């Protein structure tokens, strides 16, 4: 039985618990893991403060070349707009790219906006102020986001960019997805990007969103599989899921990552942490399902398991996988 520690991306944090309560249960390995979101998660890692690190936002092949670390996919999630607007459903309003940039640029104040209004023409929409939320926190979450943002809404592109931190025109800070939904909740009006879970577990309203080939989509954890429908990952595990091409692909979609040394100076914590990930693709894809995460596809668990095999050494140079 080991103890081992994680930190990082909030994203997949409750499959992350999940998985960790139900692998204790059947074999007495403990994982801690704390949400601390992504970029916090590279800095542990990098720090060896933890065993592995999680980030929803891909280091490059030179970055991990750079520190020594390997990284991997472990689920698909998808990022909604979770919205506090009395008198609305779930899943009934609409909105599309240009349209949520416009939000988020702080150009669109209230919900009964005539550009919401065209987009939703059976809606009665109340003439409510929109309270705009955002990360206050270094957030694969805003990575993922604003990339879908800057490909859909050129003035976003242009003035704010694409990062895990960057300078919002407007909106409330909330620390991890759990605080945005918080704010979310406690506000008439507002408007939160969220991983999937959040909005669902907080029984939170989300939108529907208009995918890259022009059609309105309901996020879904088939949704976000059908987003990953063409990613080519033979190439790479850094696949962006933003705004892509298919039928029914919900456009702010995205996998996320575990990072680990190449050399583990605690060999013994590596192969555990390689078999806990290891029993999570065997075992533990309906628990991820459950919580409406798309699983990776098996050759991709696969890919994984044939770069364990030449990436994961100890100091000696022998594999750990
Ligand atoms: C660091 C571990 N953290 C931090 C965020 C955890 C741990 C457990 C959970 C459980 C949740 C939860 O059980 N929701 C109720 C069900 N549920 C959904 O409907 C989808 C995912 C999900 O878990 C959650 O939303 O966030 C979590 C977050
Ligand atoms: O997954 P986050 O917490 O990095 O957004």
């Not at 899921?241 to 590596?270: C, M, R, V, Y």
């Not at 075992?283 to 991709?300: C, E, I």
Request: with cysteine.
């Amino acid at each position: 039985e080991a103890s081992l520690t994680g930190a990082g991306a909030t994203f997949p944090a409750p499959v992350y618990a999940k998985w960790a309560d139900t692998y204790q249960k059947e074999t007495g390995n403990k994982v801690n893991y704390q949400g601390i979101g992504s970029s916090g998660g590279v800095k542990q890692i990098i720090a060896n403060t933890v065993d592995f690190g999680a980030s929803d936002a891909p280091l490059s092949d030179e970055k991990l070349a750079q520190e020594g670390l390997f990284q991997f996919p472990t689920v698909i999630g998808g990022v909604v707009l979770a919205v506090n607007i009395p008198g609305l459903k779930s899943g009934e309003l609409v909105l599309d790219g240009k349209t949520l940039g416009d939000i988020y640029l702080g150009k669109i104040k209230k919900w009964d906006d005539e550009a919401i209004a065209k987009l939703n023409p059976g809606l009665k929409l109340p003439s409510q102020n929109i309270a705009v939320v955002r990360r206050a926190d270094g957030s694969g979450t805003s990575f993922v986001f604003t990339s879908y943002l800057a490909k859909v809404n050129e003035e976003w592109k242009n003035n704010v960019g694409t990062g895990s931190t960057v300078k919002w025109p407007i909106g409330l800070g909330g620390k991890g997805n759990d605080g945005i939904a918080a704010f979310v909740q406690r506000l008439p009006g507002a408007i939160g990007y969220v991983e999937y879970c959040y909005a669902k577990q907080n029984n939170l309203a989300y939108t529907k969103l208009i995918s890259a080939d022009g059609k309105p989509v309901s996020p879904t954890e088939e949704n976000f599989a059908n987003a990953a429908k063409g990613a080519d990952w033979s190439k790479t595990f850094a696949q962006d899921l933003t705004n892509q091409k298919g039928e029914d692909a919900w456009p702010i979609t995205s996998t996320t990552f575990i990072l680990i040394h190449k050399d583990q100076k605690k060999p013994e914590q590596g192969t555990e942490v390689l078999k806990f990930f290891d029993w999570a693709y065997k075992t533990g894809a309906k628990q991820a399902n459950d919580l409406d995460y798309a699983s990776l596809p098996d050759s991709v668990v696969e890919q994984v398991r044939a770069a364990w095999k030449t990436n994961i050494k100890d100091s000696s140079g022998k594999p750990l996988y």
